[PDB]
């Protein structure tokens, strides 16, 4: 079914509120919700919103500071592939880490924009990209969308911010599973 797959996701999400914040300022649920809030606010399609909603899903579905889970972009992507999510949502989520490594190596002042948690994890994710590694990232057809998502992940750290719950994105997740 599709109503149960999303019922597991919303269950996985709501339980992140009870976790260890992984060094951030808001719990892992508000971080997920604010990203989807900023994604939907920009007028982006449903695929971009869901990707931002589940970009750090690999932190609590199964070693980094500890400020997170190893390959949380890969683990989070693989988990959604099993549910039937599109490859676009998978790669956008899997490329959210590489998006930061690109922005840091490109913008000489992007490190300050980073959270304390995200900066510490960079020393586990590969640090600043080399000259040749950022070459391949720019070759991606979703090179634009990957940078927009990471911008929402850095912006989604607000403490005094009201954001719709996971139930607001339930219908969006159900319709997405039907298209695939």
Place of tokens 């900023």: 38
Residue 107 in marked binding region: no
Residue number with the smallest Cβ distance to Fe ion: 153
Nearest to 168 by CA among 26, 42, 46, 43: 46
Long-range contacts of 133-137 (CB under 8 A, 24+ apart): 133/101, 134/101, 134/102, 134/105, 134/106, 137/95, 137/98, 137/102
Give the shortest CB-146-to-Fe ion separation in angstroms: 12
C-beta closer to Fe ion: residue 25 or 136: 25
Residue 5 in marked binding region: no
Residue 167 in marked binding region: no
Residue 122 in marked binding region: yes
Give the shortest CB-127-to-Fe ion separation in angstroms: 15
C-beta closer to Fe ion: residue 47 or 153: 153
Residue 133 in marked binding region: no
Give the shortest CB-153-to-Fe ion separation in angstroms: 4
Between vectors from CA 177 to CA 175 and to CA 179, what angle results, nearest 5°?
75
23-40 burial code (b ≥16 CB/10 A, e <16): bbebbbbbbbbbbbbbbb
- Interface residue list for Fe ion (CB under 5 A): 56, 153
Give the shortest CB-81-to-Fe ion separation in angstroms: 18
Place of tokens 């989604």: 156
Binding residues for Fe cation: 21, 31, 55-56, 72, 96, 153
Binding residues for (1R)-(2-amino-1-hydroxyethyl)phosphonate: 24, 59, 100, 118-125, 150
């Amino acid at each position: 079914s599709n109503s149960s797959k999303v019922s597991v996701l919303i269950s996985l999400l709501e339980k992140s509120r009870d976790l260890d914040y992984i060094g951030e300022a808001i719990n892992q649920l508000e971080h997920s919700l604010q990203c989807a809030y900023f994604a939907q606010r920009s007028g982006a399609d449903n695929e971009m919103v869901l990707a931002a909603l589940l970009h750090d899903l690999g932190h609590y579905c199964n070693d980094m500071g500890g400020y997170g889970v190893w390959q949380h972009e890969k683990v989070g992507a693989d988990y959604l592939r099993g549910l039937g999510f599109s490859e676009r949502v998978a790669c956008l989520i899997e490329g959210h880490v590489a998006a930061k490594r690109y922005l840091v190596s490109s913008k000489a002042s992007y490190l300050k924009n980073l959270s304390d948690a995200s900066r510490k994890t960079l020393e586990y994710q590969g640090g600043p990209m080399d000259e040749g590694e950022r070459r391949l990232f720019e070759e991606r057809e979703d090179f634009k969308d990957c940078l927009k998502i990471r911008a929402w992940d850095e912006k989604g750290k607000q403490t005094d911010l009201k954001v719709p719950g996971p139930e607001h994105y339930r219908k969006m997740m159900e319709e997405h599973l039907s298209e695939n």
